[PDB]
Design a protein around this ligand. Structure first.
Ligand SMILES: Cc1cnc2c(C(N)=O)cnn2c1
Length: 352
């Protein structure tokens, strides 16, 4: 392992997603106790044990019992997923958006198990450390030139589809990558129509697992009430909406944005959220959450056979009589409907 073989720009990206150091920092930011059970000793069974105990928590909330029923359930959860609340007594998990908070945590943790496994497999042979990680990812990362028409589309995709309601930060595209996870091309539903290039943002610790294992669905033991539109793979057409799931801070103001070709097909359109949306798909190939703002049909350029909704995100006239989501929510429930294509290294410009 002498001189690295990878592109210098790829080397920068490899070190970034493969930093076990910040992985602890973000888990500690989520209040996870790295001391009581370090990330290095994280079994998938522990996470499947965590999911089950979250389901026992939804079983309490649905039954409405807030006594010991919930107090025992939450503690049992915390024992498998050690937390750190210090002074205050640990909190009771009571809401759909508190449930989603922990399913977010268990996902990020599972994507870290994948990660540390890949960094621990580096032995010490004839390859440079960074090159060994890349090979283990079994996914290709071609860096694109800033003057590429691909780059021209992405920057105009990035900023022109930045929602006006996420004004507390501007976004700036530091580099752009061509993604091809091995086998993904070989199974993408080429048949399905409505082929679109959709956003997915995720925390920094998750990208090794995402570039290696794709974007899986939720395990069966997960609480069903936790997922907004059901156990699927969520996307958005607005760059800022997916960039919010990057969870960049004013101090760690860099992130990664996953533009992937999503085979949506015929959409089931919904206004109010509903987790049991997978049961009511009935031949439709995806669920679409209907918002007020979205890129207008008059700016839909095509890139490698996929529709890229540019232009300013005009209004859509959507309004629910009975909550109306502001922005559109796409959900595909099988990975064959998703092929990753472009990854974006994005710097966040927060405003005070
Ligand atoms: C319910 C839900 C979950 N995740 C996302 C993302 C993302 N992960 O980038 C975008 N919209 N969205 C919506």
């Amino acid at each position: 392992g002498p001189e690295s073989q990878l592109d210098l720009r790829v080397q920068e990206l490899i070190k970034l997603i493969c930093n076990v150091q910040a992985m602890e920092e973000m888990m500690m930011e989520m209040k996870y106790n790295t001391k009581k059970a370090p990330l290095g000793k994280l079994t998938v069974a522990q996470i499947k044990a965590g999911y089950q105990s979250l389901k026992k928590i939804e079983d309490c909330i649905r039954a409405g019992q807030h006594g010991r029923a919930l107090m025992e359930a939450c503690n049992e959860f915390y024992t498998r997923i050690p937390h750190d609340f210090g002074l205050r007594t640990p909190p009771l998990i009571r809401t759909q958006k508190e449930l989603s908070e922990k399913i977010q945590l268990l996902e990020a943790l599972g994507d870290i198990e994948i990660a540390i496994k890949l960094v621990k497999s580096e032995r010490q042979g004839l390859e440079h450390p960074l090159d060994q990680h890349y090979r283990n990812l079994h996914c290709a990362l071609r860096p694109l030139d800033h003057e590429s028409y691909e780059f021209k589309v992405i920057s105009q995709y990035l900023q022109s589809t930045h929602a006006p309601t996420h004004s507390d930060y501007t976004m700036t595209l530091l580099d752009l990558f061509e993604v091809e996870k091995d086998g993904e091309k070989e199974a993408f539903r080429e048949d399905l129509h409505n082929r679109m290039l959709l956003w997915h943002g995720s925390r920094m610790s998750n990208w090794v697992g995402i570039l290696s294992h794709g974007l899986r669905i939720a395990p069966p033991e997960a609480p069903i009430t936790g997922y907004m539109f059901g156990k699927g793979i969520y996307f958005a057409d607005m760059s800022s909406k997916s960039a919010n799931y990057c969870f960049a801070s004013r101090l760690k103001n860099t992130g990664l944005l996953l533009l992937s070709e999503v085979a949506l097909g015929q959409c089931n359109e919904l206004l109010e959220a509903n987790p049991k949306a997978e049961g009511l798909l009935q031949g439709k190939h995806s669920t679409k959450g209907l918002g007020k703002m979205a890129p207008s049909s008059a700016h839909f350029v095509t890139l490698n056979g996929s529709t890229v909704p540019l232009g300013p995100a005009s209004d859509t006239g959507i309004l629910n009589p009975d909550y109306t989501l502001n922005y559109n929510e796409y959900i595909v429930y099988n990975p064959n409907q998703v092929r990753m294509r472009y990854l974006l290294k994005v710097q966040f410009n927060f405003l005070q």
